Amino acid sequence: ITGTSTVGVGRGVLGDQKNINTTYSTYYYLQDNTRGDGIFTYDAKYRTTLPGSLWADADNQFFASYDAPAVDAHYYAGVTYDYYKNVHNRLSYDGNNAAIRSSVHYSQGYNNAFWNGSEMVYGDGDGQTFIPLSGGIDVVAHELTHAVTDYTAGLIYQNESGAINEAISDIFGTLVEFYANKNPDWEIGEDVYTPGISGDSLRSMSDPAKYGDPDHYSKRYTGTQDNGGVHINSGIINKAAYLISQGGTHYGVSVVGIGRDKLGKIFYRALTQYLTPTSNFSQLRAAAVQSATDLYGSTSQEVASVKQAFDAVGVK
Numbered sequence: 001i002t003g004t005s006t007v008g009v010g011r012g013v014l015g016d017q018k019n020i021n022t023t024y025s026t027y028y029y030l031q032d033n034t035r036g037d038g039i040f041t042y043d044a045k046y047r048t049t050l051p052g053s054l055w056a057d058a059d060n061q062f063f064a065s066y067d068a069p070a071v072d073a074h075y076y077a078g079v080t081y082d083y084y085k086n087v088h089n090r091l092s093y094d095g096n097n098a099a100i101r102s103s104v105h106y107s108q109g110y111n112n113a114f115w116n117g118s119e120m121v122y123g124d125g126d127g128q129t130f131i132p133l134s135g136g137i138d139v140v141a142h143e144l145t146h147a148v149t150d151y152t153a154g155l156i157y158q159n160e161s162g163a164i165n166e167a168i169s170d171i172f173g174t175l176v177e178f179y180a181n182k183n184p185d186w187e188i189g190e191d192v193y194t195p196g197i198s199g200d201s202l203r204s205m206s207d208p209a210k211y212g213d214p215d216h217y218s219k220r221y222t223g224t225q226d227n228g229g230v231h232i233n234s235g236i237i238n239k240a241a242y243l244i245s246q247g248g249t250h251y252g253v254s255v256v257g258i259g260r261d262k263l264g265k266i267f268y269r270a271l272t273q274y275l276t277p278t279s280n281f282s283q284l285r286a287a288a289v290q291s292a293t294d295l296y297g298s299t300s301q302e303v304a305s306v307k308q309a310f311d312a313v314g315v316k
């Protein structure tokens with residue numbers, strides 16, 4: 001909508017106060033004009049018609065319980081935009097400052113979040129498996145990263161290409177979490193998963209097997225569930241990315257860590273220059289090796305570590 005840019009204040013899902021960029025025209029709307037062609041947050045009103053209504057508020061204060069998922073979806077979309085712009089020189093998900101749209105309060109008891117081809121969508125959770133999923137910066141950045149992938153490599157959401165697609169979203173979700181630097185880790189969704197259980201998460205990149213996901217290609221799932229295991233076999237790539245950044249010895253293979261920033265540069269270049277819709281894990285290895293070669297040189301430690309990491313997870 002047309003209006004003047006304003007700064008509201010509210011509380012997110014976890015009770016933390018933050019400022020939000022809003023737009024004033026009779027009401028104050030969750031429309032951030034400071035980033036690209038805007039970040040817009042919508043109320044789906046417990047239904048499944050999308051996007052719903054652009055979030056409107058009478059006083060620019062967002063402290064009601066119902067406001068909290070919208071505050072975080074809006075704010076963390078901004079963080080994610082900033083990460084891609086500041087770190088990778090990428091303007092929104094399409095590289096041309098496309099408007100970023102999110103809807104919250106999707107359906108009832110909805111234990112998930114997704115990118116629907118056009119926008120991000122967040123359930124509130126059922127209060128036991130999840131609380132409202134926009135409370136997780138890694139979840140928000142995971143979903144927006146699907147938009148990036150969809151515009152760039154276009155990895156088909158099935159089998160190995162789909163597991164790469166998922167791992168890319170977990171990788172950049174995690175790198176965005178570190179960029180914001182609140183309580184960062186290599187786990188996925190810990191801030192919104194199982195409020196009654198401390199210390200767990202939906203997936204682990206440092207130890208995928210903690211939640212039954214494979215950490216080596218020999219353990220890959222080959223059935224048909226979950227689009228051929230896209231959220232399962234992502235563990236193999238997540239583990240490789242974790243090893244590239246942090247190092248370690250995994251099934252006897254030692255990897256020299258090179259840190260998160262270089263992990264991000266290598267995988268962003270692979271995503272945007274080398275991967276294609278049909279890429280498999282072997283092709284991801286080659287794309288990552290080539291990306292590291294481009295950035296750091298063929299004789300670099302960075303290239304050697306990429307090779308070590310894919311060796312360690314059984315990807316040749």
Ligand SMILES: N[C@@H](CCCC[NH3+])C(=O)O
Pocket residue numbers: 111112113202231
């Ligand atoms: N996002 C993953 C895990 C969440 C499961 C919650 N229902 C999936 O859709 O499979």
Ligand SMILES: [Ca+2]
Pocket residue numbers: 057058059060061062063
């Ligand atoms: Ca208000």
Ligand SMILES: [Ca+2]
Pocket residue numbers: 177183184185190191
């Ligand atoms: Ca965390």
Ligand SMILES: [Ca+2]
Pocket residue numbers: 138174177184185186187188189190
């Ligand atoms: Ca996390």
Ligand SMILES: [Ca+2]
Pocket residue numbers: 190192193194195196197198199200201
């Ligand atoms: Ca928990």
Ligand SMILES: [Zn+2]
Pocket residue numbers: 142146166169
């Ligand atoms: Zn995903």
